[model samples]
Target: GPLGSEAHLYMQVQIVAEDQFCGHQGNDMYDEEKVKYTVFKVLKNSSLAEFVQSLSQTMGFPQDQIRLWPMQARSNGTKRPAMLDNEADGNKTMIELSDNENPWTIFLETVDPELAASGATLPKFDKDHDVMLFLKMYDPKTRSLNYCGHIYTPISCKIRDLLPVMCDRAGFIQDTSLILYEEVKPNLTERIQDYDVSLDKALDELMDGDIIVFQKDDPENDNSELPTAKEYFRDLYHRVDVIFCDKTIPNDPGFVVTLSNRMNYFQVAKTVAQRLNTDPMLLQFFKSQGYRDGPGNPLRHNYEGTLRDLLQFFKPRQPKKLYYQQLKMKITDFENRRSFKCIWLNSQFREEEITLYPDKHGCVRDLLEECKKAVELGEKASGKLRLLEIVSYKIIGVHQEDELLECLSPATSRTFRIEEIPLDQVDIDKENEMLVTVAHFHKEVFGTFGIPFLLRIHQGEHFREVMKRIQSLLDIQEKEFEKFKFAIVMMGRHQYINEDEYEVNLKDFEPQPGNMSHPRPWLGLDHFN
Candidate 1:
């Protein structure tokens, strides 16, 4: 029997009556009427119509009264089946099918057609999307063609399509049984949240010894596997990340958000606002277009509208990261607040406090630029600009043949605007806040320029004491003090150094006089700065 089993296509079938829903235990349609749900194995090549006739005869339902619909387990609900009709077969007509790994589920509806003149009829099948046959059955109790059921079946034409045929022959029969009957059950129910009662579900995996067949419409290749429609949609969409920073809340770092690329800038901005725990209506996004050449206006703009259009605006240059910052104030407020009554106030160094708006190029760099400018400008009256330089002095070896001074070519400097110095480091006053802003600026500069240095602004003092403090801060040995030095050049004059002799030998600063490197060197090199 086992040897000839290969010739017979082994398939599983579940039968459903019009009043009964099919499953492990049949569910009754009527309160008083008991339903029978019979699951059995059948030969794939066997005629489904003939099988239905025999089943009806055994259940005491007349052959003509029984209407059968073919179904597949993968498809839920009653629907038109994937059938190849044959008119040549006459009354012995059949729903043509291929022998595959998938099992078939059939719903049998018994009816008294007189209840409804236009008797029970099958639902129309979608040739591409649907996988089951549907039928309407009359219910005498209701006097309507309302009773229905679903059939689920797997489609295949050859033995190779069955799952079991693909399994390795080296495994023992006991091992195969364990893999299918014991091992597979736990995996299928792994995601079940409740184990108190068993949930009825279609088998997702084909048994190794059992044949499984997939449809040609499947996205997976014939040699591959089945893919869900959900998987296809996920592949179609992309994902993006957004970071929001707000300084209003003291020590508030910011918020990070993840969104789909399918969303537009307008949608993303609203989402960012929500994640930032702020009012979406009050939030505005500042997008930087970067510096332009010979431009009519600043490249940075307040971007809004559809994201697709925004993306097109940046074509030809793919940005690794797009920058955006939020502004809470209304754009119209700047106009109304002044009412032509604004006056500049002086803070320090006899310098007038400057008020710059976002409307002009000299004022803002990006969306957050205006905010930083406002803070700095507020401090500008008393703030005096200062410069700090990071220089490295390396002595290879002293009193040796390799003794050599290695200074990183030329030293560069960064400018900082300073106001009144802190009376004492302990007092956390306005001057202390200025130091924080300067530190932040230093970090931004260090990110742009790879230079590492500490901030040291000493009050007027003797040159020897300053060098001693610099040596302690830099961990330089007193013996090596001759080679290491901290030179402070203030207001374009007075270069103070630990070595007075070295400071005296330095000539006055002068610009390199030449235009050889100028773009228009042919014109004349004499007048170039």
Candidate 2:
């Protein structure tokens, strides 16, 4: 009988004034329970109106002026919950969570007498639908994407006007560079058609809580935190962890390292090379296939292969892990144990120098795999590729997947030439859409050859056609083109392709540069014609 007291049936309602709903909700993920709310004893019979009405006595607002709203929590921050306005909604809250410790919260806003009679008060009237967008920024040197901040701007704003304003808010330089648009979110990132877009996403393609980044074209800013170039794939990076089965045997816990699309081969190898007490070339790594990982011999890795590549080879249905084994002395060939630089180009044709210790550098086909990965092509696209060996400004044979491989580790450039026919059923009638050069003389592309390149001719084309091709690939224009004469230098001999068309048809003068011929032919334009 003592336990039957109805006084225990009462529940507490957490009432918050309008001050915090439009609050730090746009910032980091905030704890909803941590927010301060006033305690009001919720009567089981009270309607949503009385809850609003009751705020008057405690909040100093008359019962008629109070309106209520509620919200839900999310990672990017808290947002409005489901449509929450009915006189009975309040009564449901009181009875449903009856006597429970944590009751749901409601926001009470002060409304004017003119609108108070409508029975439903709208938050849109007070906020004017101010859209809060979280900002992100791009850096040229760091090749990093990072957080800026969130701003509440009126829905009427558009990116055309919104771009510089965001920079100003973030304390970034406003006048130095031009900016473009990329809309980003945790779920999806998209590109806006142009900067002339309505801040409200007129096409409705603009999603809520997603931000369109303000990326500037300025390169290498001293202040940092504001620039854009190749908006994607400036060596996009990934985090990878590994277990040294050779060292820890079967009981190893994996540790982590981060790698980028380029130089990952060396970046991962050098570190492992140190701990494993093995040459980067001698060390081999394997990706997990969801089988119980043991110390038994696992698949070997291409030192040129990236941390990203381990994900694609039979991508694991579950957690992916990495394992490594040291190569046996009896089984492997001795190549240079130190770092050697090779130039590789992605399908996008952007080139970067990647220094790696190739286990098979003497017959390095894995260099092709490393090059393919930098292109970010998945396993499906691997079949349509043939490694186009561009050495000495002349066309060399496209190496098939199983091609005989090697090294004349001197500077030679490599690029992927995509084939329409899949590698398995390659239809043989003159396969490539276009065959595609360089040596350094006048420092053509960006005022630096940085490293010499190689190539060879197909019984040679007209001297005029060959020169144009070479100049185009060097990324130089006709004016810079006219002043140079193309030349191929050999350890034994040298010849020039000549400015004007050669009366003689060109002929292949050199063996493909590699282990077969220790001499690498250097192709470059002769300076000062």
Whose lDDT is greatest here?
A: 2
Error of 1 at 161 (Å): 45
Task: State the lDDT of candidate 1 residue by residue for 1-529, as single tens digits.
Answer: 3556464555666665555532212111221245355676666656756676678778666565555544433222213223333222223422245335344555555554564346653444343343331222222222222223332223222222222322332122321321111112111212222223211222333221111111122223222221321222232234444444442444445565666556765566677667667655455444434353111221122444444433344435543233334455643343223211111222322323343343322211221233344444434232322212222211111121121112112223312121223232223343212111111111122222221222222333344543454455335356654643233332223332444443321112212356323211000001100
Clashes of 1: 30
| Tens-digit lDDT string for candidate 2 (111-227) | 644666766453442244555555656555665545555555667777667667667754778764545444432223345566666777632433334445545555445455323
Report lDDT (CA) for all predictions: 0.34, 0.50
Which sections of candidate 1 miss by over 4 Å? 1-9, 14-38, 57-60, 71-79, 82-101, 105-262, 268-277, 280-529
Shift in Å, residue 423, candidate 2: 57
TM-score of 1: 0.30
On a 0 to 1 TM-score scale, where does candidate 2 land against the true structure? Answer: 0.38
What would you estimate as the lDDT of candidate 1?
Answer: 0.34
